[PDB]
Design a protein around this ligand. Structure first.
Ligand SMILES: Cc1ncc(COP(=O)(O)O)c(C/N=C/c2cc(O)cc(-c3ccccn3)n2)c1O
Ligand SMILES: Cc1ncc(COP(=O)(O)O)c(C/N=C/c2cc(O)cc(-c3ccccn3)n2)c1O
Lengths: 511, 512
């Protein structure tokens, strides 16, 4: 009953899952906690800051570079002065993308402090684009109404009355009123089912997970969550959302009131590999449908590489690997080197509105320190002729083969292996009908994966965290230094886990 | 015409203002740029990360502590495990706030990565509170409609038809549910002050007055009403305008009426104790009393934004404590990162705090080990030696404000006012849109005046100042507490020079 000032409920919940541990040190793929006697217990980390730690915890190169930057008196706060490192970082990211996509496009960079902030830069810029489109359409409609009013009040044409269900001055004023309502309406964003794009006031609307989002629905523009698995259905859902404004269309003799398209949709967002969905990679059929939508609606396709970028999938850009051709791109997580906080929106230069450079800002964004560490991380992942990507791919193959070998002998409790590169997952089969009460009850609160993670922690000293909407997936996203021995120990631990779960051993799995 | 990949327009604009410089090193209150010959020129920094650097650039204690944390293998990414430092930081902030307000309240802490993110945690939690209130009101209305439907369809009462302009028994109920459903889905409102700056993300930007920053984005997110800080008598009625109501059936034994009940529209009130976007104006006691009334009246939380005013800047830890603003949530950022890392925190009073927020809100980088460690260092430093660091802020602030007043006094033709408190201070410039010099007048008319004048101060006196306020009509002075008497003299000399040239309308000298 002692006063508590943070984290009571969070900690209460972690304890009950068997995840109530304090890690006191970390290096590479290992975090250490203290046992009863006060010695350090090594735990293998497969969570790794939800995929932030492509180079592991506290990589000596990154640590050394950070300490050097600090000792050089790097200018961290230099707001509203020249900061070339921002242009330098963007030049690198531009070259990488050209190399990997074969496209010779150019991107402007705006920096921020988290993946959510970078996605919301993209939301904001998208809505700057949508406002341009809207200004132009309405300028055109003014003119159409000017022209049709010259035709009607001087001779040449008559107002066809069949179209009035949609007096000259009254019809125009009615058209302006209708169009004004429409213009002030909140836009729509399009996302995939299971999408995770952040949990701030704007981005949370873009994140499916229902208990995270639905409390906050009234605050900000919504998204429509398109069904990734059935792209045939997306056409019509998006067709539903079409809205139109009104104008007067002259045809020499006849004037009609007619509907024109209003730009409702500010952006489409996609993750190349869909973390909130259990690490499912976007299929070629889904990519082609997102291209169609982007071409059809004329809004930007925003590719969220907060998790899939910086080498994780076996290239720098997961979008490049899977052939997703976005207009904006976002990066965060691994770009901070496992130690600092940084993110970036890349916005194609032929779409980029220059006002954004001067009307958007952030105190911490583009700071010297995280700029310097960015350039380090980019140097590291690019080094030795792109060998680091090769290494991610061969480590990933190894880890996925293990995981497949485990599914194969445990398909009664494991449905699928998902993902690519070193961004992988096991889908757990539903256990809401489980024989063991305690397991069944946990399945029914959506806590299953956390319980199973607890088992792995206490019995095998392996740190795994669940992914997906009801912790129905187990995440495996270690650093590229994950050893063959560490992968064996993980196989042994999972064979153990899923054998106990086959045996419905509730006493052993739930505390 | 070479390819450019960031910042072209930004840099183009800074150059034309005379602020096109790259600082290559920083220490204390000094940043250094390289001249033509490649030597380091010291420049005195009065901007200091817009008030992030209460202890100056790269303070050796903070740098050392950071390097130690890095060398110890501090766990930066430990998501969904026990992280006591968060509770530890919040305990310290709680004790400080008790000491300074005399109130024995307790606050839960949720961390984030920027001031905007911390304000948006508060926006989210406020809207959780509003949804509780809404659920309760609508449960009550269900029951009232149940009761009035028992009265009408069995005997006792009749539906008074004088009240039907607000909308058959079943039809009136279905009409009431429809009306109430529209209302329930409506976006909430936020209340802010004129000139408010609360961040520039999708949610927070609505809460930031500056019109070119915000109005492009109006359709995205819930809006605010910007209340006139200077005339609190006017706020009552603006907020009255925003009242909205739902419908119910009220039984009075014999008679049933359709009646309006209050709907909770307002999710939160936000306030800065010292209002940066307004030119560093401190909230008056009359305005504080009006914000209390609103908070008591509406039953939504008052969110006190100490992203800038907190961590000692005003001469206490909490500016709110100094000026008697009794908020329900508090936010901190800027100086808590020690000038080197990124961190922020929302403190939400524990008797309002909804426990779901602890498990439905999260962030990858939030609550990381490194910025946690550096937070505890900063808090140790500002608290050290029996609260002497606050004393030092106050005496350095008095010194700097006295200089600035002395300068206004002999230059009241171009300076209207000194504003602010502690080491968060500003000069208000007089309008120059009627200036004799064409070049000055034109700059005044794009709202660039303060930036031009900052450029003068940079190139002619080697002093870094940045403007505040809606059309760069204020000059900010927010240095570290180590600002020396000599550095203050050099600033007086530089400003006397600046405002004498501006008196002389010397456009050639001020504008490039
Ligand atoms: C694809 C993608 N896009 C934007 C973001 C948002 O970035 P920030 O967190 O830096 O704002 C994330 C960050 N991912 C966070 C994450 C990923 C995950 O697999 C689980 C949880 C989690 C699960 C339960 C409770 C709290 N957090 N969080 C992301 O994965
Ligand atoms: C009171 C208050 N609340 C929340 C915030 C937002 O915090 P973050 O910037 O960390 O998101 C700030 C950050 N203030 C930044 C600032 C303060 C200022 O006086 C001028 C400019 C500025 C002016 C021009 C262009 C870009 N930035 N920026 C603040 O001052």
């Amino acid at each position: 009953g002692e006063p508590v000032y943070a984290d009571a409920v969070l900690n209460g919940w972690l304890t009950s899952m068997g995840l109530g541990v304090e890690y006191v040190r970390a290096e590479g793929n290992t975090v250490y906690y203290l046992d009863d006697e006060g010695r350090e217990v090594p735990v293998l980390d497969h969570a790794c800051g939800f995929g932030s730690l492509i180079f592991g915890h506290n990589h000596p190169e990154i640590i050394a570079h950070a300490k050097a930057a600090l000792d050089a008196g790097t200018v961290v706060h230099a707001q509203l002065s020249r900061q070339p490192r921002a242009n330098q970082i963007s030049r690198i990211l531009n070259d990488i993308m050209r190399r990997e996509t074969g496209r010779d496009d150019r991107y402007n960079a705006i920096f921020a402090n988290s993946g959510a902030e970078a996605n919301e830069i993209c939301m904001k810029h998208a809505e700057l684009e949508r406002q341009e489109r809207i200004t132009a359409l309405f300028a055109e409609i003014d003119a159409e109404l000017d022209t049709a009013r010259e035709a009607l009040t001087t001779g040449t044409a008559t107002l066809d009355t069949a179209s009035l269900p949609l007096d000259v001055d009254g019809v125009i004023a009615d058209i302006h009123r209708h169009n004004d309502e429409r213009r002030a309406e909140r836009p729509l964003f399009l996302t995939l089912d299971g999408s995770f794009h952040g949990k701030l006031v704007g981005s949370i609307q873009l994140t499916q997970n229902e208990p995270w989002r639905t409390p906050f629905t009234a605050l900000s523009s919504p998204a429509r969550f398109l069904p990734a698995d059935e792209p045939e259905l997306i056409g019509k859902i998006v067709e539903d959302e079409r809205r139109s404004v009104l104008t007067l269309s002259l045809d020499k003799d006849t004037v009609r009131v007619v509907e024109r398209d209003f730009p409702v949709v500010a952006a489409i967002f996609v993750e190349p590999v869909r973390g909130g969905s259990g690490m499912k990679t976007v299929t070629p059929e889904l990519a082609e449908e997102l291209h169609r939508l982007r071409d059809t609606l004329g809004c930007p396709l925003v590719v969220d590489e907060v998790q899939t970028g910086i080498g994780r999938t076996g290239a720098f850009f997961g979008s490049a690997l899977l052939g997703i051709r976005g207009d904006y791109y976002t990066l965060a997580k691994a770009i901070g080197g496992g130690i600092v906080k940084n993110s970036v929106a890349l916005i194609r230069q032929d779409r980029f509105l220059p006002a954004m450079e001067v009307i958007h800002s952030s105190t911490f964004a583009k700071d010297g320190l995280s700029a310097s560490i960015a350039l380090k991380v980019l140097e590291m992942v690019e080094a030795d002729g792109g060998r680091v990507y090769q290494r991610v791919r061969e480590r990933g193959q190894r880890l996925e083969a293990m995981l497949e070998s485990v599914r194969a002998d445990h398909s009664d409790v494991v449905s699928a292996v998902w993902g690519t590169g070193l961004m992988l997952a096991l889908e757990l089969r539903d256990q809401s009908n489980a024989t063991s009460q305690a397991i069944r009850e946990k399945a029914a609160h959506g806590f299953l994966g956390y319980v199973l993670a607890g088992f792995l922690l206490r019995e095998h000293h392996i740190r795994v965290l669940p992914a997906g909407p009801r912790s129905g997936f187990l995440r495996f996203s270690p650093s590229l230094y994950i050893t063959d021995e560490e992968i064996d120990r993980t196989e042994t631990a999972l064979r153990s886990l899923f054998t106990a779960l086959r045996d419905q051993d509730g006493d052993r799995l739930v505390l």
